[PDB]
Swiss-Prot record, chain A:
It comes from Mumps virus genotype A (strain Jeryl-Lynn). Interacts with the P protein; this interaction forms the polymerase complex. Interacts with host RUVBL1 and RUVBL2 (R2TP complex); this interaction regulates the viral transcription. It comes from the Viruses. The chain holds residues 1736 to 2100 of 2261 of the full protein. This is RNA-directed RNA polymerase L. RNA-directed RNA polymerase that catalyzes the transcription of viral mRNAs, their capping and polyadenylation. The template is composed of the viral RNA tightly encapsidated by the nucleoprotein (N). The viral polymerase binds to the genomic RNA at the 3' leader promoter, and transcribes subsequently all viral mRNAs with a decreasing efficiency. The first gene is the most transcribed, and the last the least transcribed. The viral phosphoprotein acts as a processivity factor. Capping is concomitant with initiation of mRNA transcription.
Amino acid sequence: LTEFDFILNLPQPPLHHVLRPLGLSSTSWYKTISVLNYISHMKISDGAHLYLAEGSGASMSLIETFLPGETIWYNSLFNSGENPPQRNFAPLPTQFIESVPYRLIQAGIAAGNGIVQSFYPLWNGNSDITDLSTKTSVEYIIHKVGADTCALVHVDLEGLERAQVHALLITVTVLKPGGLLILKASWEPFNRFSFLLTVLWQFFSTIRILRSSYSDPNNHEVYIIATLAVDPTTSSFTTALNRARTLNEQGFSLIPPELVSEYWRKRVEQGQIIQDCIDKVISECVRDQYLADNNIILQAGGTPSTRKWLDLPDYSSFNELQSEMARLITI
Amino acid sequence: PTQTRLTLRQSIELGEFRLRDVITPMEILKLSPNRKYLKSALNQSTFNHLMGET
């Protein structure tokens, strides 16, 4: 179990992926596990869930198994141009389709809440519609999900850019009062962080910053945990954005320096600890490490994908291994 | 063995997979059946040329 994650209530090799031994294609549920440890206490099951740029939908699956929603609106960038010939494939998360939630949806069994999840991807045929930077995408997404219809919104848009602010005011419009937003921020461009925190603070309460214990130890990744403020008397989104620009270009950042120092102090030790864990896992190759995290993945419907990608036999001796390539290369 | 595991990790970290770390040309010759291939000085020389970093 990796409990080195911490919460702050307000060009390198990818060595960290060794600690991700389960999952076909993307494995962002590993970064999600640390989020569950703090969002499971509160209630987000009621209302719809919205996943912006979710891609493979791994986080979507693992959130859905333990936090089930009535309606789920997948959304990721996809154009029909890259389909294989004579095929009309819709954007379907290849990791979510084989997961427990969609496997239980397709066969009709009810979810944990007793309400069968209704999974509707946000896709009518337009590539610009999947791209959140376009205003048409914002209007269509807000149209289909309906304003004030959902409680959880999971934005994982990688690193303000037009798509980020567009995702932000999608949430602001569509979240139910008291709803939860999880955001895939990034601490390294601190100016963008201050901007994001100010604009979110105008209309969110209980803004919590969490660094995932399973995230990369070099990317300064932060998963924002914020709740939509009840009874929001905010005039509009544009006022929040413009005023955030003012504070950004006229005064100190809303983040206290003590919180920045705390984040850095915990970040250095967390990075060192995670690096030692990765180094030990690679070197010692102990079979069983952090069983609870992978057990969560197994309950979510994840399976070890090395079985099909690596169909090679498991020799019991190193001499036989070397002999195998001695045959292979010479042949 | 942990030594070749370590050197494979080092090789992968820079972003390349060198073939010589896992198994050496002398091991290839020793652990493989004798054949007309890999029997002549020119053949062995070009095998070692194709066997190294190239």
